[PDB]
Ligand binder design. Sequence first.
Ligand SMILES: O=c1ccn([C@@H]2O[C@H](COP(=O)(O)OP(=O)(O)O[C@H]3O[C@H](CO)[C@@H](O)[C@H](O)[C@H]3O)[C@@H](O)[C@H]2O)c(=O)[nH]1
Ligand SMILES: O=c1ccn([C@@H]2O[C@H](COP(=O)(O)OP(=O)(O)O[C@H]3O[C@H](CO)[C@@H](O)[C@H](O)[C@H]3O)[C@@H](O)[C@H]2O)c(=O)[nH]1
Ligand SMILES: OC[C@H]1O[C@H](O)[C@H](O)[C@@H](O)[C@@H]1O
Ligand SMILES: [Mn+2]
Ligand SMILES: [Mn+2]
Lengths: 263, 263
Amino acid sequence: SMTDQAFVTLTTNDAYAKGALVLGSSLKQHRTTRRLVVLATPQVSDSMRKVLETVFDEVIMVDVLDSGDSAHLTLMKRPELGVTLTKLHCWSLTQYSKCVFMDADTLVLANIDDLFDREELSAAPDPGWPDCFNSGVFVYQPSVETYNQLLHLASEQGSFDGGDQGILNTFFSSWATTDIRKHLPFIYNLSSISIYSYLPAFKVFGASAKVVHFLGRVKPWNYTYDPKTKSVKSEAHDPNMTHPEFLILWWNIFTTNVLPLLQ
Amino acid sequence: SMTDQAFVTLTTNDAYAKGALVLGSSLKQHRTTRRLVVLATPQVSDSMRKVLETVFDEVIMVDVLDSGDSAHLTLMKRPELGVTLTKLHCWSLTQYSKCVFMDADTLVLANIDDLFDREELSAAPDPGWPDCFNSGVFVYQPSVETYNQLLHLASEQGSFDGGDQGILNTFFSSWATTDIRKHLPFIYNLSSISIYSYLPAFKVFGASAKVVHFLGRVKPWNYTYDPKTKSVKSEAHDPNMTHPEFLILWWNIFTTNVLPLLQ
Ligand SMILES: O=c1ccn([C@@H]2O[C@H](COP(=O)(O)OP(=O)(O)O[C@H]3O[C@H](CO)[C@@H](O)[C@H](O)[C@H]3O)[C@@H](O)[C@H]2O)c(=O)[nH]1
Ligand SMILES: O=c1ccn([C@@H]2O[C@H](COP(=O)(O)OP(=O)(O)O[C@H]3O[C@H](CO)[C@@H](O)[C@H](O)[C@H]3O)[C@@H](O)[C@H]2O)c(=O)[nH]1
Ligand SMILES: OC[C@H]1O[C@H](O)[C@H](O)[C@@H](O)[C@@H]1O
Ligand SMILES: [Mn+2]
Ligand SMILES: [Mn+2]
């Protein structure tokens, strides 16, 4: 609990760092008793690393890993996600016994320390292709064995989607079919696109949501926010705007709790 | 190979009847050893019922059940699906010990009689909210107890989505968290919206598809199909056009196997 377990995020730049900052703040807000760790790469500015060190217990510098897999990334319309291979470094954190990896585009709404009851690999179904798990929230065990197997698989075969999710699903191939306890409830990784696709289910189950995931190309930090009125300017067909209170929450935490540390 | 097990579909009109007929035809194509059963309501024309009788071993006349739940159905942009409550009559078929219910907008691509190895209630996850099962394909056990419990729950509480899926998820509430064998692989209910949302996963796993589900407001029978070239006309953002070969297969079956019996 105290020091052998951690939440772990990743940021390769100052843009996703604002996300990592909001995530870590929300984990603090909901009183985690676990360490907070962030993986960062050299593009993150020196000043931003310093700010990350005020929220996170440790900022750990790693090299970018980039799939360069243009084909499969285009197939997803996410040409910019080749560097998500950098996530594989999370397995190197052998200073911890068990960890929860959380995408820097997530936001915690409730304490989720009970995720440490789960065993590797435990993750929520991915909307869209639900026999694959979504790699935005997952419980794992750091291991030089696993780390190096994953790096080898990455270098030899790559990823079916050009990012971390394909390779992680291929490596952890039994998830769909084995042990229901490794299927985390969707309320630990609620994507805005599920709120948009089956709003009736969200109206009935959505109040129990513990983690919201701002999945997709447009990230919370790309919206224009007005803190006087607590409003965002938005464009047609936006899954974030079905239930925009999550996005406004993100911005509220940024504006009041993160912006002062960026002074 | 066993006569007291059946595939079961539903049609409340002559439009979805074309769907049922292609489904039935596809189940014959792939050598099912089970009985074929369609539930029909008084809107289905006399002549169409006779056509159904050439494909289906049993055509069974039941009364429409309609949620009238305009609020929840609108929430989903499916105003027309209140009549999907009629599906609950599938539990009345006590002449059969086990059945697979399949939507009239599914198409079989491979023998799926191994679905009868499963118990009630086995269904594939729903791509939008994957802690709910999709009610387009499901394995169940006809029963007077279950049938009446469902009609009662439908009458007094209704359905969180205005249709069958919501009430069946509420009734079979343990599905997300209990017994992984009851989570059918997505290849037994592959919705075209998953092909569209995560194309990389489809490119790697799609060859294994056993059933395709043309879920959504626009149905294969709503398309303009040219049998000479084997093409359909379509408008932007149509997830059936990501991998249109399935749509075309539906129409090839329809044109060659079914249409001659209608006109
Ligand atoms: O330029 C980047 C891009 C991503 N990230 C990190 O990698 C994560 C994944 O990227 P993200 O933009 O959140 O991807 P998603 O929009 O969430 O989309 C999917 O795309 C990937 C598929 O391989 C997976 O990483 C995700 O979990 C999955 O939800 C981010 O949260 C960050 O932690 C960076 O640090 N820098
Ligand atoms: O006017 C109708 C409408 C539907 N049906 C039958 O009911 C099924 C369900 O309707 P469908 O149009 O296929 O719904 P979907 O587009 O597949 O969308 C969702 O809509 C419902 C939600 O409650 C569930 O029935 C579905 O399985 C679920 O996938 C159809 O296949 C038919 O068997 C009719 O007979 N007549
Ligand atoms: O933004 C690209 C995304 O497309 C999808 O709809 C998938 O469900 C998601 O996991 C993927 O990474
Ligand atoms: Mn993400
Ligand atoms: Mn359907």
